[PDB]
Design a protein around this ligand. Structure first.
Ligand SMILES: CCC1=C(C)/C(=C/C2=NC(=C\c3[nH]c(/C=C4\NC(=O)[C@H](C)[C@H]4CC)c(C)c3CCC(=O)O)/C(CCC(=O)O)=C2C)NC1=O
Ligand SMILES: CCC1=C(C)/C(=C/C2=NC(=C\c3[nH]c(/C=C4\NC(=O)[C@H](C)[C@H]4CC)c(C)c3CCC(=O)O)/C(CCC(=O)O)=C2C)NC1=O
Ligand SMILES: CCC1=C(C)/C(=C/C2=NC(=C\c3[nH]c(/C=C4\NC(=O)[C@H](C)[C@H]4CC)c(C)c3CCC(=O)O)/C(CCC(=O)O)=C2C)NC1=O
Ligand SMILES: CCC1=C(C)/C(=C/C2=NC(=C\c3[nH]c(/C=C4\NC(=O)[C@H](C)[C@H]4CC)c(C)c3CCC(=O)O)/C(CCC(=O)O)=C2C)NC1=O
Ligand SMILES: CCC1=C(C)/C(=C/C2=NC(=C\c3[nH]c(/C=C4\NC(=O)[C@H](C)[C@H]4CC)c(C)c3CCC(=O)O)/C(CCC(=O)O)=C2C)NC1=O
Ligand SMILES: CCC1=C(C)/C(=C/C2=NC(=C\c3[nH]c(/C=C4\NC(=O)[C@H](C)[C@H]4CC)c(C)c3CCC(=O)O)/C(CCC(=O)O)=C2C)NC1=O
Ligand SMILES: CCC1=C(C)/C(=C/C2=NC(=C\c3[nH]c(/C=C4\NC(=O)[C@H](C)[C@H]4CC)c(C)c3CCC(=O)O)/C(CCC(=O)O)=C2C)NC1=O
Ligand SMILES: CCC1=C(C)/C(=C/C2=NC(=C\c3[nH]c(/C=C4\NC(=O)[C@H](C)[C@H]4CC)c(C)c3CCC(=O)O)/C(CCC(=O)O)=C2C)NC1=O
Ligand SMILES: CCC1=C(C)/C(=C/C2=NC(=C\c3[nH]c(/C=C4\NC(=O)[C@H](C)[C@H]4CC)c(C)c3CCC(=O)O)/C(CCC(=O)O)=C2C)NC1=O
Ligand SMILES: CCC1=C(C)/C(=C/C2=NC(=C\c3[nH]c(/C=C4\NC(=O)[C@H](C)[C@H]4CC)c(C)c3CCC(=O)O)/C(CCC(=O)O)=C2C)NC1=O
Ligand SMILES: CCC1=C(C)/C(=C/C2=NC(=C\c3[nH]c(/C=C4\NC(=O)[C@H](C)[C@H]4CC)c(C)c3CCC(=O)O)/C(CCC(=O)O)=C2C)NC1=O
Ligand SMILES: CCC1=C(C)/C(=C/C2=NC(=C\c3[nH]c(/C=C4\NC(=O)[C@H](C)[C@H]4CC)c(C)c3CCC(=O)O)/C(CCC(=O)O)=C2C)NC1=O
Ligand SMILES: CCC1=C(C)/C(=C/C2=NC(=C\c3[nH]c(/C=C4\NC(=O)[C@H](C)[C@H]4CC)c(C)c3CCC(=O)O)/C(CCC(=O)O)=C2C)NC1=O
Lengths: 48, 68, 160, 161, 70, 162, 279, 172, 162, 162
């Protein structure tokens, strides 16, 4: 991403081993950057 | 806004996986409070060992400012 | 057991056991004394079952007790029958538990890798267990011999 | 986990022993109590909600615990507490069916003491919630099953203290 | 002299001298470092009965008691 | 010297305490049991020597090389000192029987046993075999609680030597 | 001519006169084959003969469990003792071992040295036991191990310094603190040194040494891992100058083990108001 | 320390009660069987050395790895420690048998023992086995002794077994 | 908890030693003595109710002033806590009878007695007089070795309080 | 493990002291002595096979009866475990030679020796006689200070067993 959405503090949390890759992925799933771009425009069935 | 900071050891006991896996089984991870009840059950239903837990983030008091 | 397998389903859905789950525990436990008799008979004839299994095996495939064979020699043979004694034991465990949980963790998960490493023909080995079933099936009266036979055929099934 | 039938097998397997007379006697001692365990589980399961309600009423609510400053103040925490209660009841029912407490260690007690210390959850108050559910259970299940159900509630409660 | 500074009470101020001769008890050979069985302890008055009790308890023989402070 | 009486007194003294009902009950055991003990004692006392000559010989019969020349079961002095030694053991067994405890055995034979036997090249095996034999024959001189007592102390010596 | 219940009878067709299974039971015989292998010798099976000097799998090499825990210089500890008519270097070696053991590896500065007791210990007017008692009642021991700790830490530090072993049960601690409250610290220190465990082992001239890592007679088996918790390394000490000055170890949750029954079943449930009728 | 009476007393006291006629007669029966109990304890004491020795011979017969270099009963120092532990456990089992209660065994011997052995690298399964062998031989002796009056000692043989089995379970 | 059994075991353990004939003789005393002990126990157990009311009253009859207002034998709570306390003593006496030693008395009443009584202004004299009375009446409930046992333990409490 | 080096270091450490000329002089002894020690070690090492078979046999020749049935020099397993045991001794002798002290002998054979031998019914006499024989033959494999070293350690084992 052109230095976009990304993960300020998210990157340090994943590296540092404060957070584990599964966890980081879960954070990424529920975020504005994600809601917009994949759930912003779709009935309830293809977004699932 | 409350994050526990658990630590576990889960030992694979159904498959003898063949590559890597060190960090898969002995690891420290803050997991948010909303999900920590399930993560603990999942560690326990795999014969895992929950070595440590902490509050880490939240105050250990409550009512306002907890369930955000 | 049936209990271990089933309760696990209860706890995982955060609930008490179902009428169904309770019923099967009841039917299972009613079939207890018979299963215990099947294990006793076979425990009582273990040495006969193993050796006669071992003869039946080496006829059907001798090469293993020959110059370039994995079981060639007196102490390389003392180990092959010992492995046959191991699996008969696990079969008695399985029969009294009513499923394979114990049989599986103790002697199939990791095996095939285990046998393979040592370079033993896995089908050679399943003959031998299949041969043990025959000797043993014959020291039991017709009803108990079948009940025992299911556990022998399980091991034969798993090793492949 | 392990149960009475399974424990007998793994306890002997590590010694490489056939099941012998002593083993066979233990397994009989389990099978002979089996039908009674099943009936008791069906009573507990079908009265689950009433047992929690009566146990909370005798040992938790109408108190400082449910008042501001108390750990089961807020609908959130009241819900979490009786949720916990249901776990205990449900797992004790598993332990009693299995005739082995090992599941109570593997899936309930491990780390729970410190989890409760970390959140501030009152341990002594939780034990009373366990021993009140036992009291109710022992009435509902009858002479046949009372002692056998009771022990796994007692296992749970000395596991926290 | 003795052990020196004692307890501050007057009943701690009086130290006495005991010459003993400990005997081999029974039951066992001592192969460790042994000492010649005579010796002497200076004990304050406040302590004295435990010390004489454990001296005569281990087969000992109290040979002399002396008033060294008082 | 260890007896029921000395033991309870030792335990009282060490807590600075008068004898109480616990300690007097104990003493009654020792006194109630004197009759059986002392019957064993009288029987072992009058039927005595031959036990020594029997056991001495058996040491040579079980270790033949013993009674051969250059060996430690040869010549009057070895064979004399052997009889004497078994006699010492039987003597202390009777004392332990009469005393109500192992004291006489502990103080006069057990304390120091191995050091002595090791310096003098005396094998415990002989002494165990002397005692095993004495135990065989005492089977028909006594019975009931006198035999149990005799056995208790013979076995105590055999364990001291193993 | 007797009972019905010989009804256990096999029902096959019995063998004919030369079947291959009449001489079957004699066919297992006296050769070197699959029927020659002794059955009960299957468990104690080895390599291709691997004879007797193959090492064991997972070798250990004696004094490595000591090396693993780092208790090598301490299990077993060497015995230091004041011989009669000792020279100066002997007395300095004894004094150094006393200051290492009794003061728990914490350091004494040159101003803190109890000098005028040593002029006498060199005289021979006191023994090593009396010198240990005099140190343990002085302010060097009192400021470090008593003045900033609770009674549990102080009582367990007395066992480590004076007796060289760990507390055995809760009864040892509940006996000693009763003596402390009844009779003060001076009788309390004397209770360890006038005990039977000191007089039997250390006598009158032997500097107290570490005994909690080997087996001692009349011990509880919790006495070893408690001593491992008390040990803290060869370059460790029971100093207070850290961030937690003498927090307790071997907590009375160790000394009494499992619990069985009780929680106080208290009622913060509420009761009161009264109206009457209609039901 | 508890014995079987002391145990009764502690449970009674926790009720605030004089001993129940139930508990009284259970203890009257223990007094009834006490001569047999004394013979049973005496059977072990009188053969302690052989019980340990025979257990030992058989343990190393089975587990020839322990007496190889690398093994936990090698060299002489370690074998002496292992022989010593066999004696210690047999000793506390005999104490429990005189007492009619396992507590002295659990409190003075078994408490912490497993964690000691693991710290040391001592194979607990081998130690458990050595305890199983001591049990076989010890009971052998309890059942077939020198001119004891003939009767039934199976209740006591069971109870002795549970003390051996406690120790084994606790350690493995 | 001090009994003949625990004492001999303690003494063996502390010398790293199997139980020997000395220690088993001791145990036989305790077992032989159980019958008399347990008869005393049963008699004291069923008469407890009245033994307690008898002794409670006797404390007031010997110390009349206690029952006047402003005093410690006045009001339901003092008189209730008194009955209870004598009942505690009789209870531990029966326990000591059944146990074969003073342990129950030592651990539950003697350890700490004076400190407690001194903080709470409880005079031992009352308790001695309660026990002296209980001793008078137990003269006709028992005889022979059961009476001697009952006496042993009652007297043990009286000495603990002097 | 006791060597000249470890001993001087232990003595320094225990006085909180750097190694001084006293301790370094000592170390030079151990280093100067290594040549003779290590020659003994190499000779004992390559002859091990036969030194062991020689001593094993000599145990049977001096104690003929050992090789009869029912005895402890009979059957493959006893005779195998014997060779092994003498081999252990020679092994630790070479180690002690190479190490510059008795440490290896003290830690691996001496500590515990008697307890083990006593539980297993192993007579020291055999082992002394094995070692006396090994000492006879080592007379012609070595000479001068290598022989003195070999002797020092063989004799050390014989004294450990007496
Ligand atoms: C949202 C709140 C939050 C904070 C504040 C935060 C800090 C933080 N700083 C980090 C590293 C770092 N922080 C610095 C900071 C500095 N270097 C200097 O010399 C200066 C003194 C200072 C800047 C003024 C540096 C250089 C690293 C990299 C260390 C490395 O190379 O691993 C890391 C490790 C992961 C990573 O490298 O990103 C974290 C998590 N993380 C968070 O989640
Ligand atoms: C990529 C680097 C890496 C390594 C090295 C690694 C080791 C490793 N070994 C494991 C278990 C294990 N490791 C062993 C090993 C042995 N058993 C013995 O007795 C022998 C002494 C030894 C073989 C020589 C065994 C038996 C287990 C299973 C333990 C269990 O049953 O849970 C586990 C637990 C998860 C699993 O069971 O797979 C890990 C992660 N993991 C990694 O990611
Ligand atoms: C601030 C967040 C919060 C709330 C709201 C709360 C409610 C609450 N309501 C309760 C009982 C109750 N609440 C009611 C209420 C009603 N009965 C009816 O039929 C009506 C529908 C309703 C009145 C409008 C009744 C009747 C009980 C008694 C129920 C029982 O005792 O079984 C109790 C248990 C008694 C106690 O221990 O206090 C709690 C904790 N607790 C909290 O922490
Ligand atoms: C499957 C086995 C299992 C158990 C037993 C379990 C317990 C458990 N109880 C929790 C919290 C809690 N537990 C309670 C319990 C109580 N409150 C009281 O005052 C009473 C004394 C008591 C009820 C009787 C409360 C109030 C919380 C919420 C604490 C918070 O606000 O964070 C949490 C934190 C995560 C969450 O809030 O869900 C866990 C994991 N988790 C599990 O996985
Ligand atoms: C500094 C080095 C040192 C020496 C030299 C020493 C001698 C010494 N020998 C003693 C006893 C003894 N010494 C002997 C020696 C003998 N009995 C005889 O008949 C023979 C003539 C002689 C042997 C040749 C005996 C028998 C006793 C015990 C006396 C008794 O307790 O009755 C004792 C009394 C303590 C004990 O018994 O352990 C000491 C201190 N102690 C030491 O620490
Ligand atoms: C108070 C208790 C007590 C005991 C038990 C005792 C044993 C004892 N046996 C000894 C010698 C001896 N013991 C024996 C024993 C035997 N010779 C044989 O023919 C048989 C093989 C065997 C008898 C079974 C022999 C031959 C000697 C002489 C050893 C010597 O001086 O070379 C000696 C050396 C002093 C001496 O020469 O008399 C002692 C102290 N001494 C005691 O004071
Ligand atoms: C209870 C308090 C107490 C006193 C009073 C005491 C005196 C005392 N002075 C001593 C030595 C000494 N005292 C002196 C004193 C002197 N030399 C001279 O020429 C002067 C006349 C005089 C100084 C004014 C000397 C030189 C020695 C050493 C003697 C030697 O070792 O050769 C010693 C021998 C032990 C040692 O040297 O430390 C004692 C016990 N010790 C005590 O514990
Ligand atoms: C540093 C100064 C210091 C303190 C403060 C201290 C506390 C302390 N209290 C203890 C026991 C105790 N403390 C109590 C106190 C109480 N019981 C109750 O029910 C009440 C709520 C409370 C009185 C108000 C009791 C009953 C015990 C004995 C517990 C037992 O052994 O079962 C113990 C265990 C050792 C012993 O019993 O002597 C310690 C160390 N020790 C110290 O050295
Ligand atoms: C086994 C051999 C051994 C070692 C190595 C040892 C280390 C050690 N250093 C200590 C303290 C100390 N160590 C230092 C050292 C330093 N301060 C600094 O700022 C520098 C960075 C550094 C010097 C280079 C200081 C200042 C203390 C005192 C800390 C305090 O009390 O506040 C203490 C606490 C006890 C005491 O103060 O005597 C130990 C045990 N003790 C031992 O027995
Ligand atoms: C409370 C009574 C009590 C017990 C039970 C006890 C156990 C115990 N066993 C120990 C060692 C030991 N225990 C053994 C035992 C064995 N080795 C094997 O291979 C076999 C499987 C087994 C014999 C059956 C060995 C070999 C050691 C020495 C370990 C080492 O130092 O490497 C140690 C370490 C201290 C020492 O070596 O003396 C303790 C404390 N200590 C006690 O005070
Ligand atoms: C010195 C301590 C001491 C001991 C040891 C002791 C033993 C003792 N065992 C006895 C009985 C007995 N002892 C046994 C024991 C056995 N029966 C068997 O067949 C088994 C092999 C063995 C099992 C342990 C039996 C069956 C009786 C007879 C029944 C009875 O009196 O209870 C009797 C009653 C008298 C008799 O019938 O001989 C005594 C006094 N008394 C004591 O004061
Ligand atoms: C387990 C054994 C045990 C004993 C023996 C025991 C004695 C005992 N008696 C007490 C009080 C008492 N004891 C009495 C005794 C009497 N009042 C009278 O009318 C008579 C003069 C007399 C009976 C002879 C009284 C009046 C109190 C109340 C004292 C107070 O709190 O002011 C208390 C203070 C706690 C309380 O108030 O209950 C103790 C601990 N407690 C124990 O746990
Ligand atoms: C590291 C140093 C070390 C030594 C020295 C050692 C000695 C030793 N010898 C043993 C057995 C043995 N030792 C022998 C010895 C002999 N048999 C004969 O034919 C001859 C008479 C004699 C040789 C001179 C025998 C026969 C056994 C078997 C004893 C048994 O188990 O019954 C055992 C018992 C364990 C086992 O059975 O292997 C030990 C520990 N172990 C060690 O770890």
């Amino acid at each position: 991403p052109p230095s976009y959405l990304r993960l300020s503090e998210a990157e340090s949390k994943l590296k540092n081993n404060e957070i584990s890759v599964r966890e980081f992925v879960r954070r990424l799933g529920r975020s504005e950057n994600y809601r917009k771009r994949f759930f912003e425009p779709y009935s309830s069935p293809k977004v699932v | 806004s409350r994050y526990f900071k658990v630590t576990a050891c889960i030992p694979s006991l159904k498959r003898v996986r063949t590559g890597r896996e060190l960090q898969n089984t002995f690891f420290t991870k803050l997991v948010p409070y909303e999900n920590w009840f399930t993560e603990q059950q999942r560690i326990q239903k795999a014969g895992g060992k929950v070595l440590s837990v902490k509050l880490f983030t939240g105050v250990q008091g409550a009512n306002t400012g907890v369930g955000a | 057991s049936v209990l271990t397998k089933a309760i696990v389903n209860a706890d995982a859905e955060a609930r008490y056991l179902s009428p169904g789950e309770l019923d099967r525990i009841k039917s299972f436990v009613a079939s207890g004394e018979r299963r215990l008799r099947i294990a006793q008979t076979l425990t009582e004839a273990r040495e006969r079952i193993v050796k006669q299994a071992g003869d039946q095996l080496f006829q059907i495939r001798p090469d293993v007790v020959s110059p370039g064979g994995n079981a060639y020699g007196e102490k390389m043979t003392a180990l092959c029958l010992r492995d046959l004694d191991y699996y008969l034991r696990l079969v008695t465990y399985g029969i009294v538990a009513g499923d394979v949980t114990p049989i599986e963790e103790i002697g199939i998960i990791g095996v095939k890798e285990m046998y393979n490493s040592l370079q033993t023909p896995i089908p050679a080995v399943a003959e031998g267990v299949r041969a043990m079933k025959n000797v043993a099936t014959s020291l039991l009266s017709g009803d108990d011999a079948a009940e025992a036979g299911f556990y022998f055929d399980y091991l034969v099934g798993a090793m492949q | 986990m392990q149960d009475a039938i399974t424990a007998v097998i793994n306890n002997y397997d590590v010694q490489g022993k056939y099941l012998d007379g002593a083993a066979l006697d233990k397994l009989k001692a389990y099978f002979t109590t089996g039908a009674v365990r099943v009936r008791a589980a069906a009573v507990i399961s079908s009265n689950a909600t009433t047992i929690i309600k009566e146990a909370a009423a005798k040992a938790l609510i109408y108190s400082d615990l449910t008042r501001p400053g108390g750990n089961m103040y807020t609908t959130r925490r009241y819900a979490a507490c009786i949720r916990d209660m249901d776990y205990f009841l449900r797992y004790a029912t598993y332990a009693m069916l299995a005739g082995d407490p090992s599941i109570l260690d593997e899936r309930v007690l491990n780390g729970l003491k410190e989890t409760y210390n970390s959140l501030g959850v009152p341990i002594a108050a939780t034990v009373g919630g366990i021993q009140a559910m036992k009291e109710v259970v022992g009435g509902l299940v009858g002479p046949d099953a009372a002692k056998e159900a009771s022990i796994y509630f007692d296992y749970l409660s000395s596991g926290l203290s | 002299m003795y052990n020196n500074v004692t307890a501050n009470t007057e009943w701690g101020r009086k130290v006495f001298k005991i010459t003993v001769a400990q005997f081999p008890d029974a039951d066992g050979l001592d192969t460790d470092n042994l000492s010649q069985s005579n010796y002497f302890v200076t004990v304050p008055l406040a302590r004295l009965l435990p010390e004489m009790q454990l001296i005569k308890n281990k087969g000992g023989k109290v040979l002399s008691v002396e008033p060294v402070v008082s | 010297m260890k007896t029921v009486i000395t033991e309870v007194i030792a335990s009282a003294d060490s807590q600075g305490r008068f004898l109480n009902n616990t300690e007097l009950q104990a003493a009654n055991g020792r006194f109630q049991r004197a009759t059986a003990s002392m019957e064993a004692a009288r029987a072992l006392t009058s039927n005595a020597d031959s036990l020594v000559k029997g056991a001495v010989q058996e040491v040579y019969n079980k270790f033949p090389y013993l009674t051969q020349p250059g060996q430690m079961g040869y010549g009057d002095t070895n064979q004399a000192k052997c009889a004497r030694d078994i006699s010492h053991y039987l003597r202390f067994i009777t004392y332990s029987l009469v005393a109500g405890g192992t004291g006489p055995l502990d103080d006069y034979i057990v304390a120091g046993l191995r050091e002595v036997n090791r310096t003098f090249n005396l094998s415990p095996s002989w002494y165990i075999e002397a005692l095993k034999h004495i135990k065989g024959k005492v089977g028909s001189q006594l019975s009931g609680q006198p035999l149990t007592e005799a056995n208790a102390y013979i076995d105590y010596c055999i364990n001291a030597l193993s | 001519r007797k009972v019905i219940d010989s009804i256990k009878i096999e029902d096959p067709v019995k063998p004919g006169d030369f079947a291959n299974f009449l001489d079957m039971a004699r066919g297992i015989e006296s050769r070197t084959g699959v029927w020659s292998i002794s059955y009960e010798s299957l468990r104690t099976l080895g390599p291709p003969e691997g004879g007797m000097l193959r090492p064991a799998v997972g070798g250990t090499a004696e004094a490595a469990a000591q090396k693993q825990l780092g208790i090598t210089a301490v299990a077993p500890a060497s015995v230091v003792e004041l011989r009669p008519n000792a020279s100066e270097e002997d007395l300095q070696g004894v004094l150094r071992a006393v200051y290492r053991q009794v003061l728990g590896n914490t350091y004494v500065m040159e101003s803190e040295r109890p000098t005028q007791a040593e002029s006498l210990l060199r005289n021979g007017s006191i023994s090593v036991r009396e010198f240990v008692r005099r140190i343990a009642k002085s302010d060097l021991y009192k400021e470090r191990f008593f003045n900033k700790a609770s009674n549990n830490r102080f009582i367990e530090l007395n066992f480590k310094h004076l007796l060289g072993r760990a507390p055995y049960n809760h009864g040892e601690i509940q006996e000693h603190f009763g003596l402390y409250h009844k009779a003060g610290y001076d009788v309390e220190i004397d209770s360890y040194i006038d005990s039977d465990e000191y007089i039997e082992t250390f006598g009158e001239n032997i500097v107290p040494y570490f005994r909690g890592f080997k087996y001692q007679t009349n011990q509880s088996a919790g006495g070893f891992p408690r001593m491992v918790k008390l040990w803290g390394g060869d370059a460790g000490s029971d100093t207070d100058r850290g961030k937690n000055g003498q927090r307790t170890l071997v907590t009375t949750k160790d000394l009494i083990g499992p619990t069985k029954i009780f929680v106080p079943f208290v009622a913060p449930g509420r009761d009161a108001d009264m109206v009457s009728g209609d039901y | 320390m508890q014995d079987a009476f002391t145990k009764a007393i502690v449970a009674a006291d926790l009720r605030g009660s004089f001993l129940s006629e139930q508990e009284l007669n259970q203890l009257t029966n223990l007094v009834k069987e006490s001569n047999k109990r004394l013979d049973a304890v005496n059977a072990i004491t009188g053969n302690a050395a052989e019980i340990i020795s025979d257990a030992a011979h058989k343990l190393f017969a089975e587990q020839t790895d322990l007496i190889r270099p690398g093994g936990n009963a090698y060299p002489n120092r370690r074998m002496a420690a292992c022989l010593r532990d066999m004696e210690i456990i047999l000793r506390y089992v005999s104490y429990a048998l005189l007492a009619g209660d396992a507590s002295v065994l659990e409190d003075r011997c078994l408490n912490g023992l497993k964690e000691t052995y693991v710290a040391l690298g001592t194979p607990t399964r081998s130690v458990a086995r050595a305890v199983q062998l001591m049990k076989e031989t010890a009971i052998g002796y309890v059942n077939s002794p020198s001119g004891v009056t003939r009767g039934d000692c199976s209740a006591l043989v069971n109870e002795a077994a549970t003390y051996f089995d406690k120790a084994a379970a606790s350690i493995a």
